[PDB]
RNA sequence: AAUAUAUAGGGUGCGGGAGGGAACGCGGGGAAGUGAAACAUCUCAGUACCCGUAGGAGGAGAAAACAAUUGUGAUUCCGCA
RNA sequence: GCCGCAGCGAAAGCGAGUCUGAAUAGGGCGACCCACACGCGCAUACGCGCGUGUGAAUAGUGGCGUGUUCUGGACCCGAA
RNA sequence: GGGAUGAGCUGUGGGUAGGGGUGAAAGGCCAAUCAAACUCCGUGAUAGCUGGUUCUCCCCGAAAUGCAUUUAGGUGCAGCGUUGCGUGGUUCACCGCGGAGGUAGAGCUACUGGAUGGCCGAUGGGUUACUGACGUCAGCCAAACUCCGA
RNA sequence: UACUAAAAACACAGGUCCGUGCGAAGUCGCAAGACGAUGUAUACGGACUGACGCCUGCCCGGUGCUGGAAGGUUAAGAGGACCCGUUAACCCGCAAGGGUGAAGCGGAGAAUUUAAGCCCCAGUAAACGGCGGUGGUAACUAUAACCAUCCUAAGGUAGCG
RNA sequence: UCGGUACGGUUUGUGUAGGAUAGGUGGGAGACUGUGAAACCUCGACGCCAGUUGGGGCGGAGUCGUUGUUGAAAUACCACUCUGAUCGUAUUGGGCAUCUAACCUCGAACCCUGAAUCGGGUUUAGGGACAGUGCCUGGCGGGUAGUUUAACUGGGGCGGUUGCCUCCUAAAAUGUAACGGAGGCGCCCAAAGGUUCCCUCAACCUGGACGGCAAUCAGGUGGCGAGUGUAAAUGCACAAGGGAGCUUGACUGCGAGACUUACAAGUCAAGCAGGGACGAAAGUCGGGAUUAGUGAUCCGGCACCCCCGAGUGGAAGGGGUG
RNA sequence: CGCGGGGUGGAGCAGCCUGGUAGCUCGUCGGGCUCAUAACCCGAAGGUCGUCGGUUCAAAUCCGGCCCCCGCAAC
RNA sequence: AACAUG
């Protein structure tokens, strides 16, 4: 009746609450959209519903038979192969269980011969349980349909943001019965999101989503569930409908508040200043002070420190040249006959699907590539600072301090000696939460790590790789109203549509099709630009796949 | 900032030791070699 | 009778009720001071006082009962427990 | 019928013992007589282990008195 | 002395009853009694408070302290009296002997704090009138100073 | 203020505010009833003020009263996931035992749905109530008509001392 | 009029290859002339390949069909039903509206009624499943009622103090009062605990790049003047103080004999065994150099022991140990 | 006597409680505009965060004890 | 539409 329920459920530490009386259910086919800031508690909830972890009280309870399945904040894989990643989880209980039935048909006489009655046929009881069991010409069945890379090349450095698209294809193939896919569109496509708009919105079963698109949350969910610091709400309607009721919310509590701090203040006098006025009825009246002044200070929250950028030194006139430039692999065709200077302050955007070459055009940049037939021109007085897409600096086990200053006291950023503890502050982390592993750190909080170590050198090139993921509106402003203030030369690849309409003045893209793939077409001027010479001077200005029978 | 913890067998699951640790010098649960009585001999204890 | 079936009501005739009493009984209402070394739950107490109402006595009563692998066989009252 | 007639234990219980304990380890509460002779693997000597009596002294319950006490007004007088 | 044809005075008969009446309002008045009348009953209310307690002799004889108290004028337990049964010099004094001390005293080139005259001389003051240390020979002081010590 | 207080105390005429559309509001009563009144907004009860003349300034934050479509929190009633006691049967073994358990009957019951009030938003001061500081500046001094500034719901106007 | 349940007919679904798998499972040569070429056409579903034989208003003749064979399967056809949609009956619940008949009337009229502003009855005029009342349930409530409101205090009131730890007062055992004189506490430590092995500090004189009155170096004199996680006192150089290795005794079952003490409590402990850590061993360890860092009883909560189980089996509850 | 606020650039003041950065309004010094001073506009200078130090990598802030300033205090 | 005075 309930796919899953949950009791007065508190995940927390004992210092830092995570998680606070959190009592809610959920029906099947119950379509969620989870919102809310980033330290609220959106992924330590999303982690309990599929057991991998337990709460400190209360019992979470799934349903009797219906399994969950989970995609994390980081998507792990195995270090086998690609085809390896569509028979870990998914398709586990019937490919580990099919040679195992090619194996007992041996024809074995001296062993046994009326045993392949209760083992054989029991094996051919389980593949009835599936419904199909050749798995062969219904498994380019499940890669024809996310675009997966070809099935014969490990998940090595060869694979880039389309990880994400394998591991979406571990999950979406077990089919469970409460999905909890936690931010699925993260390094997308144009497309790609595209395709798992229409996939999850005819999908038999519960779905969980933290998402931030806007197709899944106006058209997909029903039930729109705030996460405040802690505490959690559910709603019904749309994301449309949310956004109204929780407008008129916000009014009639932005006055709720502001009676409530005059009343603090007309009666702390009255408790601090002149205590002769009343004797033997004081210990009465004061705990009426502590009582709301002990709630007052539960919803205090606004404490935002900006992301800041730091400057090094003057810029000159020279910054990037590339001397038409090819890059590629053997027989693969990436970066062809590219030629393009890099605007001295000037925010530069990079466009293109999954699979183009985006990340390997700043691998080129810093000198982890070296091009195959061209040359790139550094310039003698800029400086680094690469931030990559796969977050590669991360060490899962030492803690956050550890991780950006190296166990030293002052580093070196921006022609200066900062205390190094003092610069992992001023990227949001208070003091004595230096000390908890950077493994276990928030989906903003490792996008507010990225950006520690590796604007740790001043640098006046630095090279944005997937800034906008996983951070919440309140830093995404402030991220895009802290590098325009920054002297020179941001280059930044991104997928929100959304981010380089507001902060772009160059844009570099693909435009490749049957002729050759490994086109690169430079503008100059901003994408409220680019989206407009493009259909003036090209032609190409759907048809879903099932991923399943039915 | 001290609260009192209590330390479990690892085999037969009993309750046998209180005792308090710091909370922001050790957020995971101890480990220690105490004496359960119900077994006999020193068995392994974490928290709760 | 209003108003038609008819009731309300009215005339006549036989019976009966009412008030009193010292305690005892049965059903119903029901305090506080006091004790808690203050006090509210609690006690004092279902007492004091009140209300209906009997009879020489009243109430109870002939198992929709008790007991425990045996068994007593309606109720009241005094002794133990 | 009450109190004596056997105690230990939270209790199942076991019983001159019982509870705690893994313990014929230690405790907690409770039982258990010499001044002999004889007897005694007898010991320098000294009575421990065990004997018939030489017949070590335990003992409670019920009346009526007295002192104090518990419940009732409770030694007597006294409020607003 | 004030009102004295008005919101006047008065006679006769009537009405309102106790946490209620009535009040041109003072907590005033309701049978000489009113911040809640009187009479009877619960009732021999209760009072850590006050006053009283009646014939005789013989023996022995206190305490006014400790600890706890919604307690300081009360009370529990101990201390100290008496008596019954047990124990038998165990108590007490003086003498000899074996022990712990840091009081009075005194001492401070033994320490921690003070502290007074010379020799001595850094930092401050006006190139040196003054500040004169830490040190150094004599005289001092101490409940929270003691190498000592009745 | 019968019995120490006759006044500056109360009352009064007039003034304003709020209640009340009629077996009204208020009041005595557990109720039926009654007064209000054999009255009907120029009437009737409540509040403060107290002839008459001139006047009755500023503040709606606090706390009352009045009116509010919402929004948050909220009682019973409804709702009865999941869990627990029991055992017809079915398991394994020592048939002194251990494991799963439909139906019926029971205990405990979370999600969800649900009102005034409270919060909140407006009006009201002849509602209860409140109505400030520091520093500088003018032809000797003295003093500031003017300026800077903080705090407030708003900073004491007319008249008097 | 808006939603839930129950039943029933219709309708719905498009990777690529094939005349869009007409969705799953189970069957099966059937449909009879309904050509599709009227219309909300193309079944009016999706309007993505632009089409899935049924509100069919030229018809009664010809029908995507069986035959064709690309693909896990194309193939007509009904029946059972999945995530949806859409109409129809039955039942129930929520909202507003209408009706009269339960209830309401101090609207009128006529009777009992001779004398009646009571009461009841009849007829009529209106209100109407609201009101009122009952049982449960929240709100409001000095409008009334029962009561509490500590003690010490050089008389009470305002201030201040109340337990625990150390010193002085304290009169050389112990103890000793005041609103006497000074100060601390309601912790902290997973090592700053246990053990085993080593080490001697602060100040100063002489000398030494930066380097200073004092940072580190080297040599002399230095018996304790430093240090001790915390306040003081007694200790501590033999170290209880500085450093390193391995570890959990920051134990389970007990404890003869004591100090203190009105009682309740508080404190110490050789040693015996189970099992460990350290160490070659002797042995040492039942937390911290010691003395503060906490709170009786009752009622409850949790984990274990399966002790009693209100006829019996269990269970509820109670009980023991933490 | 005792209680309780406060000290942030010449004057008035935010920043704290919820540690890393010192800021705003007038004024002061220099430029500009005007015939010239006001007004206005652009640029500056100015603070050991009252002081003596405790923890910390780091104190305007957390922490006490001292020094001034203010408020309130007797029957 | 701003413009105060020797
Ligand atoms: N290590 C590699 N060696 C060879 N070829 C590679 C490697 N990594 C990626 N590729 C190829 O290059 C293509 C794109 O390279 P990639 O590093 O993913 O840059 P990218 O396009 O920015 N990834 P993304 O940010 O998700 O778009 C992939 O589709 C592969 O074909
Ligand atoms: N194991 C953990 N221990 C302590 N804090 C944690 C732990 N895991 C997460 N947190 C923090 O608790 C909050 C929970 O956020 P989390 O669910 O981890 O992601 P989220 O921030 O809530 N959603 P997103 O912002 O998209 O990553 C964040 O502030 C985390 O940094
Ligand atoms: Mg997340
Ligand atoms: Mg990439
Ligand atoms: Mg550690
Ligand atoms: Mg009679
Ligand atoms: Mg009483
Ligand atoms: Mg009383
Ligand atoms: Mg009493
Ligand atoms: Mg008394
Ligand atoms: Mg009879
Ligand atoms: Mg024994
Ligand atoms: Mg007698
Ligand atoms: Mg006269
Ligand atoms: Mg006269
Ligand atoms: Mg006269
Ligand atoms: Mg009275
Ligand atoms: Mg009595
Ligand atoms: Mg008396
Ligand atoms: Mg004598
Ligand atoms: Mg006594
Ligand atoms: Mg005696
Ligand atoms: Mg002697
Ligand atoms: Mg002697
Ligand atoms: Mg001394
Ligand atoms: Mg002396
Ligand atoms: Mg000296
Ligand atoms: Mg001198
Ligand atoms: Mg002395
Ligand atoms: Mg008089
Ligand atoms: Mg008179
Ligand atoms: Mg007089
Ligand atoms: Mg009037
Ligand atoms: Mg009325
Ligand atoms: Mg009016
Ligand atoms: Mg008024
Ligand atoms: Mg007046
Ligand atoms: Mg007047
Ligand atoms: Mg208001
Ligand atoms: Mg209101
Ligand atoms: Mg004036
Ligand atoms: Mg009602
Ligand atoms: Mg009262
Ligand atoms: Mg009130
Ligand atoms: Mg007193
Ligand atoms: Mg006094
Ligand atoms: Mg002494
Ligand atoms: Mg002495
Ligand atoms: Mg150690
Ligand atoms: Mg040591
Ligand atoms: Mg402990
Ligand atoms: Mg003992
Ligand atoms: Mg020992
Ligand atoms: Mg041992
Ligand atoms: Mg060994
Ligand atoms: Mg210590
Ligand atoms: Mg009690
Ligand atoms: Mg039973
Ligand atoms: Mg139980
Ligand atoms: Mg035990
Ligand atoms: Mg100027
Ligand atoms: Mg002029
Ligand atoms: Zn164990």
Not at chain 1, 145 to 153: K, T
């Amino acid at each position: 009746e309930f796919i899953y329920t949950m009791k007065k459920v508190r995940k927390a530490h004992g210092d830092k609450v995570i998680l606070d009386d959190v009592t809610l259910s959920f029906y099947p086919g119950a379509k969620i959209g989870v919102v809310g800031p980033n330290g609220a508690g959106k992924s330590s909830v999303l982690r309990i519903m599929a057991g991998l972890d337990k709460p400190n009280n209360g019992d979470a309870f799934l349903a009797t038979g219906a399994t969950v399945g989970i995609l994390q904040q980081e998507p792990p894989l195995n270090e086998d192969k690609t085809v390896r990643g569509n028979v870990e989880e998914g398709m586990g209980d019937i490919k580990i269980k099919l040679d195992r039935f090619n194996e007992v048909a041996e024809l074995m006489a001296t062993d046994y011969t009326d045993e392949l009655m209760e083992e054989m046929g029991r094996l051919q009881e389980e593949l009835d349980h599936a419904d199909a069991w050749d798995l062969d010409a219904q498994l380019e069945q499940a890669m024809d349909a996310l675009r997966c890379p070809p099935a014969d090349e490990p998940v090595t450095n060869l694979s880039g943001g389309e990880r994400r698209r394998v591991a979406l294809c571990k999950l979406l193939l077990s089919k469970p019965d409460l999905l909890l896919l936690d931010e699925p569109t993260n390094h997308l496509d144009a497309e790609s999101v595209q395709w798992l708009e229409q996939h999850l919105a005819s999908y038999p079963g519960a779905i969980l989503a933290v998402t931030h698109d806007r197709y899944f949350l106006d058209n997909v969910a029903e039930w729109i569930l705030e996460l405040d610091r802690g505490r959690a709400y559910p709603y019904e309607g749309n994301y449309s409908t949310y956004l109204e009721k929780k407008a008129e919310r916000l009014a009639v509590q932005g006055r709720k508040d502001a009676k409530l701090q005059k009343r603090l203040t007309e009666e702390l006098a009255w408790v601090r200043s002149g205590a002769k006025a009343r004797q033997a009825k004081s210990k009465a009246r004061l705990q009426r002070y502590e009582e709301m002044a002990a709630e007052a200070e539960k919803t205090r929250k606004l404490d935002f420190e900006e992301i800041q950028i730091p400057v090094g030194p003057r810029l000159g006139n020279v910054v990037v040249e590339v001397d038409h430039l090819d890059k590629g692999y053997d027989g693969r065709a990436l970066i062809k006959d590219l030629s393009f200077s890099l605007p001295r302050n000037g925010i530069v955007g990079v466009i293109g699907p999954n699979g183009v070459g985006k990340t390997t055009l700043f691998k080129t940049i810093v000198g982890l590539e070296t091009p195959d037939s061209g040359s790139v021109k550094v310039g003698e007085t800029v400086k680094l600072s690469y931030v990559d897409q796969a977050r590669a600096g991360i060490d899962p086990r030492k803690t956050v301090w550890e991780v950006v200053s190296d166990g030293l006291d002052y580093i070196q950023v921006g022609q200066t000696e900062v205390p190094s503890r003092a610069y992992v502050s001023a990227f949001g982390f208070k003091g004595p939460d230096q000390q908890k592993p950077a493994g276990v750190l928030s989906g903003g909080e490792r996008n507010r790590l990225n950006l520690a170590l590796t604007l740790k050198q001043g640098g006046n090139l630095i090279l944005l790789d997937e800034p906008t993921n996983d951070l919440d509106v309140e830093t995404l402003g402030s991220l895009e109203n802290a590098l325009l203030n920054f002297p020179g030369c941001a280059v930044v690849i991104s997928h929100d549509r959304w981010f380089l309409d507001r902060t772009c003045t160059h844009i570099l893209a693909w435009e490749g099709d049957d002729d050759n793939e490994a086109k690169w077409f430079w503008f100059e001027g901003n994408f409220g630009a680019y989206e407009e010479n493009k259909v003036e001077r090209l032609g190409v200005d759907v048809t879903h796949r099932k991923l399943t029978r039915g | 900032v001290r609260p009192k913890i209590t330390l479990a067998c690892e085999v037969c699951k009993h309750r046998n030791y209180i005792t308090k640790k710091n909370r922001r010098n050790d957020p995971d649960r101890l480990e220690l070699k105490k004496f359960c009585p119900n077994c006999g001999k020193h068995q392994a204890h974490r928290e709760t």
